[PDB]
Design a protein around this nucleic acid. Structure first.
Ligand SMILES: COc1cc2ccccc2cc1[C@H]1C[C@H](O)[C@@H](COP(=O)(O)OP(=O)(O)OP(=O)(O)O)O1
Ligand SMILES: [Mg+2]
Ligand SMILES: [Mg+2]
Length: 540
DNA sequence: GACCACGGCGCC
DNA sequence: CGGCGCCGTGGTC
């Protein structure tokens, strides 16, 4: 019993659609349909039929909305059961997974996807009745955010292709030089991109000591960590590290990105996946524009290739230490709150209470160490690991850990309070009430239990930070539109905007305020803002 | 031509 | 001994 009716569908219908490939900016729309009351309407011509819809409503609504924006159609995404499912349990990441769990079959037919969307929305919307915090997240953050992401994906970012093509040649010559030297020291050619062949050269032929093994197969590891500890053992090691650095950036960024420029837009379009992480973070893929290099000198050159349209500037806004500020709020630790209320640099404050200097006498050597202890405790770093990263005895690493919690006792209290709650309810929660179900919190194997604990007490911090960024994007986007400005990229605690040259300053100031005041905490949120013609100079 | 597992590594 | 996605290799159908 499957009711069929002629195109077009009534208002409020749930859409189903089939793409030739997973990227909506690149996809051919193969079929389109819509279902209401279980009655399914199928479009004779999908592209024409797109014009008849008022909104995109159903599984993966954002994807269809991106394709529609590509065709110059204003078809905003509305209700999407994936978002509901994801808020219920962020392990719900795919239509297939959601259908398997809650009911139905995710197939490759437009009509059935449309019918499935409606059935899943009814089912899932009902499971959320009573869950007012989850429903607030849905109505106020996720659903409106999906429209923000749709415009971000369809706008894309301009890329300096010629610059990257020239950068490619230059890096290739450096790669060729390093390869020759490695062959010389090895005494023969081999595939240097093959870790299996490298393993033999290093540990069988040159007889260097094997330090660690790989997780699944127990091979001798050639990871950067192992090679770092082996720098002094042979001149070939340092050469391999340099090689790895260059080929990593060339094979992942320099060479592939130029070929991903879209013919219609002349820009580069990523995908912002809204139901992909266990914490409420977004992810970026096809290509991933959330891991563009920045740390090393060659990486910074890649950033310069991301630029603004002619007559526009890039506006880069970054939350300063958002996770620690969230931690201050959640824990209520008076010491940690004080640091932020007085506008001091926690990383610099840490180094002072580590090296016994005052906050003025802290060089980057000591702030680099402060970073380690601060993030180490946030993520559950072990004493052994800390002793290695700081190059200190294991016993004084233990003492540093204890001194930290002695200085921030409410943090320790909050961790333990969060885990007990986790053990009891079976999930942990962000400030806004986003949930992550964490099993094995009471596992009888210590290593399993403790791994689960770190996941558990991390999620409220990372997830709250994610909620604040997401909400800021929701509030900011319509202010950007009314100023003729664009949202281009989100990198977890960073936003990149594009604005006309003249309004760039006013957009920068406004965006800063909206982000800083998105949701007031016991501590202020500070936002570093910068303006430039490219991503590097903008952040500089 | 397609797929997948693994080690390895880019970013927050 | 926190959260992601992409690469090349080696193997397979
Ligand atoms: C595994 O976790 C980490 C451990 C670290 C240990 C030592 C050093 C760095 C580390 C970085 C990270 C991850 C997690 C972090 O969110 C991200 C950015 O780290 P930034 O260096 O940008 O820290 P900020 O506070 O922005 O410093 P600043 O910009 O204000 O000077 O990298
Ligand atoms: Mg930073
Ligand atoms: Mg993996």
């Amino acid at each position: 019993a499957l009711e069929e009716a002629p195109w077009p569908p009534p208002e409020g219908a749930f859409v189903g659609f089939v793409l030739s490939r997973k990227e909506p900016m690149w996809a051919d729309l193969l079929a389109l349909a819509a279902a209401r009351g279980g009655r399914v309407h199928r479009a004779p011509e999908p592209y024409k039929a797109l014009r008849d819809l008022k909104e995109a409503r159903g599984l993966l609504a954002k994807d269809l909305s991106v394709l529609a924006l590509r065709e110059g159609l204003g078809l905003p995404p509305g209700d999407d059961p994936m978002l509901l499912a994801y808020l219920l349990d962020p392990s719900n990441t795919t239509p297939e997974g959601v259908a398997r769990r809650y009911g139905g079959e995710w197939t490759e037919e437009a009509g059935e996807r449309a019918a499935l969307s409606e059935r899943l929305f009814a089912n899932l919307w009902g499971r959320l009745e009573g869950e007012e915090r989850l429903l607030w997240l849905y109505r106020e953050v996720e659903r409106p955010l999906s429209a923000v992401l749709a415009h971000m994906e369809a706008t894309g970012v301009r890329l300096d292709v010629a610059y990257l093509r020239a950068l490619s040649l230059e890096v290739a010559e450096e790669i060729a030089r390093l390869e020759a030297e490695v062959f010389r020291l090895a005494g023969h050619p081999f595939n240097l991109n093959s870790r299996d062949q490298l393993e033999r050269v290093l540990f069988d032929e040159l007889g260097l000591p094997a330090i660690g093994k790989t997780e699944k197969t127990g091979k001798r590891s050639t990871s950067a960590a192992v090679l770092e500890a082996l720098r002094e053992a042979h001149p070939i090691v340092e050469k391999i590290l340099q090689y790895r650095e260059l080929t990593k950036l060339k094979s992942t960024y320099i060479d592939p990105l130029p070929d991903l420029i879209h013919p219609r837009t002349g820009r580069l379009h990523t995908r912002f996946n809204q139901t992909a992480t266990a914490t409420g973070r977004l992810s970026s893929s096809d290509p991933n524009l959330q891991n563009i290099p920045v740390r090393t000198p060659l990486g910074q050159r890649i950033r310069r290739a991301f630029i603004a349209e002619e007559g526009w500037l890039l506006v880069a806004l970054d939350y300063s230490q958002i996770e620690l500020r969230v931690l201050a709020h959640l824990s209520g630790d008076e010491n940690l709150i004080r640091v932020f209320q007085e506008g001091r640099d926690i990383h610099t404050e840490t180094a002072s209470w580590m090296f016994g200097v005052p906050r003025e006498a802290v060089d980057p050597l000591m702030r680099r160490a402060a970073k380690t202890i601060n993030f180490g405790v946030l993520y559950g770093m072990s004493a052994h690991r800390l002793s290695q990263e700081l190059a200190i005895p294991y016993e004084e690493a233990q003492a540093f850990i204890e001194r930290y919690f002695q200085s921030f006792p409410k943090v320790r209290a909050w961790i333990e309070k969060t885990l007990e709650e986790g053990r009891r309810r079976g999930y942990v929660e962000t400030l806004f009430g986003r949930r992550r179900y964490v099993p094995d919190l009471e596992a009888r194997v210590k290593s399993v239990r403790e791994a689960a604990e770190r996941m558990a007490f991390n999620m409220p911090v990372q997830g709250t930070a994610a909620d604040l960024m997401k909400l800021a994007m929701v509030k900011l986007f319509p202010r950007l539109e009314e100023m003729g400005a664009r949202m281009l990229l989100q990198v977890h605690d960073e936003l990149v905007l594009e604005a006309p040259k003249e309004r760039a300053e006013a957009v920068a100031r406004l965006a800063k305020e909206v982000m800083e005041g998105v949701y007031p905490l016991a501590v202020p949120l500070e936002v570093e803002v910068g303006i430039g013609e490219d991503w590097l100079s903008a952040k500089e």
